[PDB]
Amino acid sequence: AVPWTELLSLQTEDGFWLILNLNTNGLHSFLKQKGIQSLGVKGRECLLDLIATMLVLQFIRTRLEKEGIMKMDIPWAFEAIKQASEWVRRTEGQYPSICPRLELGNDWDSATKQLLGLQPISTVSPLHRVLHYSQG
Amino acid sequence: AVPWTELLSLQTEDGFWLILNLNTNGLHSFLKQKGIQSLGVKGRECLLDLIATMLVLQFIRTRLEKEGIMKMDIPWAFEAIKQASEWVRRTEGQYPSICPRLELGNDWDSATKQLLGLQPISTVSPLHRVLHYSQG
Amino acid sequence: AVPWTELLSLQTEDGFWLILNLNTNGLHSFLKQKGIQSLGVKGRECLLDLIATMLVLQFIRTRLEKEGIMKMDIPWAFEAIKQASEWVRRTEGQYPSICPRLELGNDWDSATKQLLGLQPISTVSPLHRVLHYSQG
Amino acid sequence: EFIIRIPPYHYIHVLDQNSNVSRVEVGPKTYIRQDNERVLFAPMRMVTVPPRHYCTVANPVSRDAQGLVLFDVTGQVRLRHADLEIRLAQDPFPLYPGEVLEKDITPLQVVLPNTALHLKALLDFEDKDGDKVVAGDEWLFEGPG
Amino acid sequence: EFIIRIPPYHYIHVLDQNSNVSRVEVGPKTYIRQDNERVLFAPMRMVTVPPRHYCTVANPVSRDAQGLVLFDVTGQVRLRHADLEIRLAQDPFPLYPGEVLEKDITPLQVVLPNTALHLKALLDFEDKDGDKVVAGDEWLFEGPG
Amino acid sequence: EFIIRIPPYHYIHVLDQNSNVSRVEVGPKTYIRQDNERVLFAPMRM
C-alpha cells in the first residue's frame, strides 16, 4: 500500500530522483565525510541524483518481487521506469568502481539493499548509523 | 483457492516473474552473499527474473499435479504459461550448471522444490534460513 | 460417488494427467531422491505426466472393475480414455524397464496398484512413506 | 549393586574413581566391582552387523599394525577423535568408552542396471586405483553392482 | 570442593592465590588442590577439531622452535596478545588461561568449478610464493578446490 | 572425610576394603585416601 501516484507527483523533469522512509540528513552527512565535495559542485549533484534514482529503482524492484514478478525497463508506470532506467544507464559509465570507493558495497545491488535496510550490515562496515540515527 | 487472476494482474510485459508466500528479503540477502553482483547489473536482474519465473512455474505445476493432471507449455491461462515457458527455454542456455554453483540444488526441479518448501533441506545445505527467517 | 465431470474439467490440452486422494508433495520428494533431475528438465515433466496419466487410468480401471466390467481404450467418457491410452502407448516406448530402476515395482500394473494404496508394500521396499506421510 | 552378571555377548563400562578412567568388560561373565569403582549402566548388547549391511562409529579406537587395541599409559584407550569408521559384517564387537554409534545397521545399497552413482570426494585420500583423489573431485560409479 | 576428578580429555584452571597465577590441569586424572588454590570452573572438554574443519583462538600461546609452550618466570604462560591463530585438525588441545575461542568448529569452505574467491590482504605478510603481499592487495583464488 | 592431615608424631590406621588389610600411616603428613579405603579413627599420638 505504498504511495504510487505520489511518486510520479515528485517525478523530476529529466528522469532523476517520506515516500522512501530513509534518513536523508544522516545520509548526506555520511557522504559529506567521504569527500563528495572534491568531485565538483556539478558532479556531486549528479552523483546524488544517481544514488536517489537507484534507490527508487530498488524500492520498485522490492515492491515487484514480493509478488514474484539497468534491466528493469505494470504497464501504467512503464514510461517513468523506462526513462529512469535510460537515465541510469547513461551516467553510470562516468563512475567505474564508485560504490567501493565511497564505501557502500561491491556494486549497486549490494549498495541499495544495505541502504534500503532489508539486508544485514557488518561491523567492519561504517554503514551502521544510517538506519540507527533515525532510531535516535 | 490460490489467487489466479491476481497473478495475471502482476504479469510483466515480457514474460518474466504474497501470491507466492515466500521470504523475498531473505532470499535476496541469501543471493547477495553468493556473488550475484559479479554477473553484471544487467545480468543479475535477468537471473532474478529467471528464478522468479521458475518459481511461478513450479507453483503452477504443484497446483496442477495435486489434482493429478520447460515442458509445461486449463485453456484459459494457456497463453501466459506458453509465453513464460518460451521465456524460460531461451535464457536458460546462457547459464549451464548454475544451480550447483549458486548452491540451490542439482537442477531447477531440485532447486524450486526446496525453495518452495514442500521438500526437505539437509543440514549440509545452507538453505535452512530461507524458510525459518520468515518464522522469526 | 467419485467426481467424474470434475476430472474432465482438469483434463489437459494434450491427453496427460484431491480427485486422486494421494500425497503429491511426498511423491515429488520421493522421486527427487531417485535422480529424476538427471533426465533433463523436459524429460522429467514428460515422465511425471506419464506417471500421473497411468495413475488416473488405474483409478478408472479400479472404478470399473469394482462393478466387474494400454488395453483400456461407459460411452460418454470413451473419448478421453481413448486419447489418454493413445498418449500412454506412444511415450512408453521411450522408457524400457523404468519402474524397476525408479524403484516402484515390476511393471506399471505393479507400480500403480502400490501407489494407489489397495495392495501391500513390503519392508524391503522404500514405498512405505508415500501413504504414511499423509498420515502424519 | 555390587554383583554384576554380564550375559553372553554383552558389555558394560565401569569407572575407576581413583583414576577417573573407564573401560569395557565383556563376555558371558560375572563381574565383581570394588568400592571405588562404579558400573555406568545396565549391560547392553555388543552390537552386531549382518552381511550386506554396515554401520559408522564416531571416534574409532586406534588399533595397531595387527588390530590390537592400543591403550594410554593411564589405562585409557587410544581413540581417534572426531573421525568415523565404517564397519562391515563381523563378530559382535563392543563399543569402547567415548564411542558413539551414529549410523545404525543400514543396508549396503545396490545400484541397478543402467544406473549410476554421483560421488564427491569430501576429503583428499588415495584410492585403491593409485590416484591422488583431491577433495572436490566427482565420480561416476556405474554398473549393476 | 577439595576433590577434583578430571575426566579423560578434560581440563580446568586453578588459581594460585599466593602468586595470582593460573594454569591448566589436563588428563584422565584426579586433582587435589591446596588451601590457597582455587579451581575456577567445573571441568570442560578439551576442544577438538575434525578434518575439513577449523577454528580461530584469540590470544595464542607463544610456543618455541619445537612447539613447547613457553612460560613466564612467574609461572604464567607466554601468550601473544590480541592475535588470532587458525587451528586445523589435530588432537584435542586444551585452552591455556587467557584464551578465547571466537570461531567455533567451522568447515573449510569448498570453491566450485567456474567460481573463485575475492581475497584482500588485511595486513602485510609474506606468502609461500615469495611475494611481499602489502596490505590492501587483491586476490583471485580460482579453481574447484 | 577424604582429607586426612596427620600432625607431627601421630598415626592412623586405614582399611583396604579390597583386601581386608590394614596398616599404619605416620608422619607430619597429609594423607589422601581412596574410595575403597577407610581410616579407622581420628589421629592419635605415637
Curated annotation (Swiss-Prot), chains A, B, C:
Gene that encodes it: PARP4
Tissue: Widely expressed; the highest levels are in the kidney; also detected in heart, placenta, lung, liver, skeletal muscle, spleen, leukocytes and pancreas.
Function (record text): Mono-ADP-ribosyltransferase that mediates mono-ADP-ribosylation of target proteins.
Compartments where located: Cytoplasm; Nucleus; Cytoplasm, Cytoskeleton, Spindle
Source lineage: Eukaryota, Metazoa, Chordata, Craniata, Vertebrata
Highest taxon of source: Eukaryota
Full protein name: Protein mono-ADP-ribosyltransferase PARP4
Subunit and interaction comment: Component of the vault ribonucleoprotein particle, at least composed of MVP, PARP4 and one or more vault RNAs (vRNAs). Interacts with TEP1.
Interaction with the major vault protein: annotated segments: 1-136
Part of the full-length chain shown: 1570 to 1724 of 1724
Coiled-coil portions: none
Annotated family: Belongs to the ARTD/PARP family.
UniProtKB/Swiss-Prot annotation, chain F:
Transmembrane feature ranges: none
Induction: Up-regulated by IFNG/IFN-gamma.
Protein modification: Phosphorylated on Tyr residues after EGF stimulation. Dephosphorylated by PTPN11.
Tissues expressed in: Present in most normal tissues. Higher expression observed in epithelial cells with secretory and excretory functions, as well as in cells chronically exposed to xenobiotics, such as bronchial cells and cells lining the intestine. Overexpressed in many multidrug-resistant cancer cells.
Start-end of each MVP repeat: 1-46
Subcellular location: Cytoplasm; Nucleus, Nuclear pore complex; Cytoplasm, Perinuclear region
Domain text: MVP 3 mediates interaction with PTEN. MVP 4 mediates interaction with PARP4.
Subunit organization: The vault ribonucleoprotein particle is a huge (400 A x 670 A) cage structure of 12.9 MDa. It consists of a dimer of half-vaults, with each half-vault comprising 39 identical major vault protein (MVP) chains, PARP4 and one or more vault RNAs (vRNAs). Interacts with TEP1. Interacts with PTEN and activated MAPK1. The phosphorylated protein interacts with the SH2 domains of PTPN11 and SRC. Interacts with APEX1. May interact with ZNF540.
Role description: Required for normal vault structure. Vaults are multi-subunit structures that may act as scaffolds for proteins involved in signal transduction. Vaults may also play a role in nucleo-cytoplasmic transport. Down-regulates IFNG-mediated STAT1 signaling and subsequent activation of JAK. Down-regulates SRC activity and signaling through MAP kinases.
Name of the protein this chain belongs to: Major vault protein
Organism, scientific name: Homo sapiens
